[PDB]
Amino acid sequence: CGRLPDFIAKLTNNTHQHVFDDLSGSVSLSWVGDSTGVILVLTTFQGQSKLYRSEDYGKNFKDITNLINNTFIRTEFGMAIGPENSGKVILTAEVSGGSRGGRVFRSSDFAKNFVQTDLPFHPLTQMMYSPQNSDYLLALSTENGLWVSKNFGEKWEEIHKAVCLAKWGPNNIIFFTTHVNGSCKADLGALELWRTSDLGKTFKTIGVKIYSFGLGGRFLFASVMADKDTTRRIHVSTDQGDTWSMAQLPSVGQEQFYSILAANEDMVFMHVDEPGDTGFGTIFTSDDRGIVYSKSLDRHLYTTTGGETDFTNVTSLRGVYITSTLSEDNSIQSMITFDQGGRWEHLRKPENSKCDECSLHIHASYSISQKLNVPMAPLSEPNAVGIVIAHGSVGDAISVMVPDVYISDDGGYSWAKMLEGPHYYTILDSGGIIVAIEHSNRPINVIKFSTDEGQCWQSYVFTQEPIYFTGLASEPGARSMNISIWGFTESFITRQWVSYTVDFKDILERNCEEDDYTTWLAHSTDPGDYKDGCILGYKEQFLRLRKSSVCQNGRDYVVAKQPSVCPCSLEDFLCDYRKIPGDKCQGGMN
Numbered sequence: 001c002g003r004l005p006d007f008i009a010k011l012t013n014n015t016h017q018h019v020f021d022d023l024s025g026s027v028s029l030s031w032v033g034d035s036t037g038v039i040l041v042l043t044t045f046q047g048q049s050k051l052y053r054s055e056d057y058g059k060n061f062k063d064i065t066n067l068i069n070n071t072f073i074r075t076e077f078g079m080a081i082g083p084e085n086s087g088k089v090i091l092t093a094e095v096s097g098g099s100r101g102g103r104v105f106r107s108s109d110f111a112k113n114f115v116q117t118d119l120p121f122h123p124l125t126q127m128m129y130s131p132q133n134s135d136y137l138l139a140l141s142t143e144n145g146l147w148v149s150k151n152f153g154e155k156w157e158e159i160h161k162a163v164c165l166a167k168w169g170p171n172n173i174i175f176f177t178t179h180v181n182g183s184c185k186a187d188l189g190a191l192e193l194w195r196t197s198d199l200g201k202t203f204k205t206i207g208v209k210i211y212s213f214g215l216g217g218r219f220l221f222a223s224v225m226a227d228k229d230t231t232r233r234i235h236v237s238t239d240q241g242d243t244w245s246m247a248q249l250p251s252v253g254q255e256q257f258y259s260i261l262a263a264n265e266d267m268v269f270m271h272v273d274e275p276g277d278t279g280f281g282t283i284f285t286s287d288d289r290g291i292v293y294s295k296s297l298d299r300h301l302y303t304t305t306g307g308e309t310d311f312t313n314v315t316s317l318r319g320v321y322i323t324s325t326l327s328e329d330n331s332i333q334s335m336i337t338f339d340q341g342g343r344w345e346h347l348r349k350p351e352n353s354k355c356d357e358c359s360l361h362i363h364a365s366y367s368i369s370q371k372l373n374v375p376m377a378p379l380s381e382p383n384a385v386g387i388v389i390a391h392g393s394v395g396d397a398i399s400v401m402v403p404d405v406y407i408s409d410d411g412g413y414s415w416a417k418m419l420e421g422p423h424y425y426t427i428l429d430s431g432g433i434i435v436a437i438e439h440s441n442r443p444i445n446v447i448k449f450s451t452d453e454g455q456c457w458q459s460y461v462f463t464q465e466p467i468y469f470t471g472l473a474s475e476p477g478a479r480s481m482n483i484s485i486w487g488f489t490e491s492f493i494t495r496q497w498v499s500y501t502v503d504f505k506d507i508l509e510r511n512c513e514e515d516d517y518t519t520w521l522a523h524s525t526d527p528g529d530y531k532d533g534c535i536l537g538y539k540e541q542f543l544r545l546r547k548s549s550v551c552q553n554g555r556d557y558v559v560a561k562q563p564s565v566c567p568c569s570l571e572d573f574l575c576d577y578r579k580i581p582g583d584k585c586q587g588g589m590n
């Protein structure tokens with residue numbers, strides 16, 4: 001491997017330290033908008049709150065605690081960040097014992113100015129933005145009242161009482177459950193599901209005997225109790241609850257649960273927990289109506305009701321998902337699907353790695369929850385086509401051994417060891433740079449980076465004062481070249497939070513050209529087959545950045561791809577026959 005020259009000089013003047021020398025114990029960070037560089041940092045000591053604001057992607061911060069009048073901010077509610085570039089921020093404050101209602105600091109200009117607002121109620125939940133209109137907010141009160149605002153939280157009205165759960169639907173529709181006689185936990189299974197399309201002026205009861213409800217893609221789901229039984233079933237609606245269909249899914253008992261694993265405009269991955277405290281269930285995939293379900297994966301790991309699952313959307317390649325399954329011997333084995341759950345498969349072992357014949361197993365939420373030496377779950381970005389990064393074990397099952405970091409560049413078909421120890425990682429510039437920080441219980445001062453998709457790595461010493469590393473921060477969307485390295489210095493009585501923001505603009509000094517990209521057929525496994533690369537009835541050819549090209553994709557980078565319809569085979573249909581949701585094959589068989 002040949003390394004690019006003089007990278008130290010291109011990063012020293014692009015390294016920016018900021019110290020947060022308050023006495024806080026916890027730190028939370030929110031990005032506000034895209035292409036703004038606005039970061040809000042809230043530090044808490046338990047109490048005192050400090051509010052810091054950056055507008056250069058974290059290179060410099062300003063103390064703006066005076067903008068909230070030095071009020072303690074309750075971390076339970078977080079920072080209610082408005083969608084897209086609305087620039088909306090809502091912080092929930094603590095009040096005294098005799099206050100009639102709550103207090104909230106509202107900003108609509110990317111945290112440049114905050115307005116202090118007294119509420120006619122005490123908030124029980126975070127204030128939720130309507131996807132259709134960021135001025136429309138709902139919240140539940142401590143008396144389980146449903147409150148709605150049309151003017152970004154300035155004025156509130158209580159549209160219904162005894163509300164247990166409320167969610168925005170499309171076009172400013174509100175769905176919510178309510179109880180009549182009792183409470184929310186007591187009347188579990190006797191709730192009613194209501195809908196209002198006019199922000200509380202009129203109401204329609206769209207369900208009774210309700211356990212709970214949820215939204216996923218185009219689908220409205222409700223679990224409904226049986227008449228003379230303690231079991232419950234899933235009903236689904238695609239017309240905002242005007243009509244319902246019984247999902248072709250098994251019923252479950254009180255000790256079981258349903259969980260939406262993933263949902264888009266085509267279909268839903270649904271987890272049905274198995275009876276008993278055995279920690280696993282079954283994955284089913286829906287049709288385009290959310291009614292017909294095909295069994296996709298048996299013995300899917302999902303510990304308890306609100307427990308841990310390893311289900312992972314490989315967002316860098318269409319149709320690819322990874323998750324963990326419980327073996328018959330109660331060992332954990334990773335499985336990968338490339339066709340949206342049509343079939344699952346063991347992950348292919350890297351060629352050079354040895355078994356501790358075997359396969360690759362991926363560490364995710366469950367491994368992290370069990371306090372394994374795994375700092376991050378899998379990472380993928382849609383604009384960085386084919387790239388998957390994860391901690392893994394090569395062998396027969398998930399192992400507690402010190403895991404290596406593995407990378408795929410084709411969406412999970414092939415794998416290679418990326419780095420030796422456990423590392424935090426982050427993808428920048430749509431894959432133009434991959435960054436990694438060693439996971440250690442010792443202080444560190446090195447950030448590793450790769451410009452060839454993880455094949456070659458350079459180490460950069462970003463500070464002479466090593467830090468206990470805690471996490472990476474970068475602009476969501478993976479289009480920036482800025483990376484914030486967060487850690488702390490420690491004395492005998494306090495911790496000094498510090499961030500180092502490195503700008504890679506001089507590493508990727510030139511913009512990528514058309515010559516810098518090459519054609520790549522996704523899902524290619526055998527060019528001799530007529531249907532090579534066909535997934536859900538069509539294949540796609542991408543323009544991928546050459547690994548050898550050292551250049552910036554750009555903030556306005558758009559993945560260039562060209563689809564080609566494949567002939568329909570029996571693999572494109574499910575049993576009602578019905579074509580698979582999202583399948584776009586034409587001609588062929590039927």
Ligand SMILES: *[C@@H]1O[C@H](CO)[C@@H](O[C@@H]2O[C@H](CO)[C@@H](O)[C@H](O)[C@H]2NC(C)=O)[C@H](O)[C@H]1NC(C)=O
Nearest residue numbers: 262263264265266267269313314315316318382
């Ligand atoms: C998993 O991740 C992929 C990529 O993020 C999802 O794909 C997209 O679907 C959404 C909404 O349905 C549209 O926002 C995007 O245009 C799609 N993006 C791409 C790159 O395909 C996919 O829907 C997710 N899987 C599931 C089942 O939710």
Ligand SMILES: *[C@@H]1O[C@H](CO)[C@@H](O[C@@H]2O[C@H](CO)[C@@H](O)[C@H](O)[C@H]2NC(C)=O)[C@H](O)[C@H]1NC(C)=O
Nearest residue numbers: 035037055056057059479480481482503554555
């Ligand atoms: C990373 O952060 C830098 C600023 O620290 C970004 O720079 C800016 O460039 C944009 C558009 O060229 C202008 O919005 C801003 O005025 C600049 N910011 C400042 C304060 O100088 C840079 O764009 C980020 N890196 C990437 C690729 O996103």
Ligand SMILES: *[C@@H]1O[C@H](CO)[C@@H](O)[C@H](O)[C@H]1NC(C)=O
Nearest residue numbers: 068069070071103115116117
């Ligand atoms: C700001 O805080 C000070 C001291 O706590 C208080 O006296 C003042 O009334 C506050 N301003 C408000 C509540 O707007």
Ligand SMILES: [Ca+2]
Nearest residue numbers: 273274275276
């Ligand atoms: Ca169970």
Ligand SMILES: [Ca+2]
Nearest residue numbers: 451547549550
């Ligand atoms: Ca490159």
